[PDB]
């Protein structure tokens, strides 16, 4: 029992069509290994200034016979500064024809995100706190846990195939693994945090140099680019020619010339001899205006986002606390086994 779900490559994010409520109201929502809560855009939400938050489906709680309004205020904040607020509730959620009942979600009535988010990370990382960090509501069974608990999958686990940079679609598989879509063997890596799907990154090879790292990296489907501590990012920027630019009082971004040569690869070395090779096309990102970002950016948090993850096949196992990885093989061939 595996559940395949199509991932829409939207550019900066990968989203899936899911349904919510007794009347199966279609929501197109970001598939996010970096958050743990599922929220939907209320049909009467107030979007953030300049944000078209109602173009990817909306949810009307009043037309679902099964919708339960829990008492409780919902608030979440993301790495890029975006936020959502609303109220906690429960309803039926349907994923590629497979329904789960009484799933706790948030009904969002204000958001600066473009669409809803389906957070599928650890339950310990749920957004169950007020602004000051006081816990306001209990931790609860999020979507992957509920899939397991209601007998839809055997193990709280999922495989991620973002597919190639040009592809319109990829696939996420809850409770299974597509053994046709990688070369070599999946190498199991220990998850190093009890809250975040992070594994140890031993080193990064770029432009003929090996840069020792030895710290955790978040494998985040819901991040576009790749983020590293400032000093490590600066070491890589030195080989690549990326230049740091101050864009706000506290924000700095690496820019790079749009016509920069993109031959060569960047290699990421993990535990147990696991290795992911990323083509350097992944490190030039086109902005609207004729400038480009470098695909690595500085941050206190280390995150391998989509520009990395497109080049790996990943089996996240939240029960075993492992993420198993192998170099991706882009193919329509498919041979899925349950996990």
């Amino acid at each position: 029992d595996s559940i395949s779900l199509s991932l829409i490559n939207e550019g900066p994010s990968y989203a899936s069509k899911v349904s919510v409520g007794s009347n199966k109201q279609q929501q197109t929502v970001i598939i996010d290994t970096g958050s743990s809560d599922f929220w939907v855009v209320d049909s009467n939400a107030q979007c953030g200034k300049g944000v078209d938050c109602k173009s990817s489906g909306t949810f009307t709680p009043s037309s679902s016979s099964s919708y339960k309004n829990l008492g409780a205020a919902f608030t979440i904040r993301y790495g890029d500064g975006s936020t959502s607020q609303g109220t906690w509730g429960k309803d039926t959620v349907t994923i590629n024809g497979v329904s789960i009942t009484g799933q706790q979600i948030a009904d969002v009535t204000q958001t600066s995100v473009d669409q809803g988010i389906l957070g599928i990370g650890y339950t310990s990382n749920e957004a169950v706190y007020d602004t000051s960090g006081r816990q306001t509501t209990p931790n609860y069974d999020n979507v992957p846990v509920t899939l397991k608990k209601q007998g839809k999958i055997r193990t709280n686990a999922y495989s991620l195939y973002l597919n190639s940079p040009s592809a319109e679609t990829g696939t996420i598989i809850f409770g299974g693994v597509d053994n046709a879509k990688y070369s070599g063997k999946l190498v199991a890596e220990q998850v190093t945090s009890s809250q975040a799907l992070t594994i140890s990154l031993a080193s990064v090879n770029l432009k003929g140099s090996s840069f020792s790292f030895g710290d955790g990296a978040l494998l985040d489907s819901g991040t576009t680019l790749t983020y590293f501590p400032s000093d490590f990012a600066a070491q890589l920027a030195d080989k690549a020619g990326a230049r740091l630019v101050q864009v706000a009082r506290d924000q700095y971004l690496y820019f790079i010339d749009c016509n920069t040569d993109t031959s060569g690869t960047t290699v990421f070395n993990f535990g147990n001899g696991a290795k992911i090779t990323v083509p350097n096309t992944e490190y030039v990102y086109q902005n609207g205006d004729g400038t480009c970002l470098w695909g690595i950016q500085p941050s206190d948090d280390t995150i391998l986002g989509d520009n990395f993850l497109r080049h790996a096949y990943l089996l996240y196992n939240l029960d075993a606390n492992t993420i198993s990885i192998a170099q991706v093989k882009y193919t329509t061939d498919s041979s899925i086994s349950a996990v």
Partner: peptide, 5 residues
């Protein structure tokens, strides 16, 4: 984008 806290 960069998805929690």
């Amino acid at each position: 984008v960069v998805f929690a806290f």
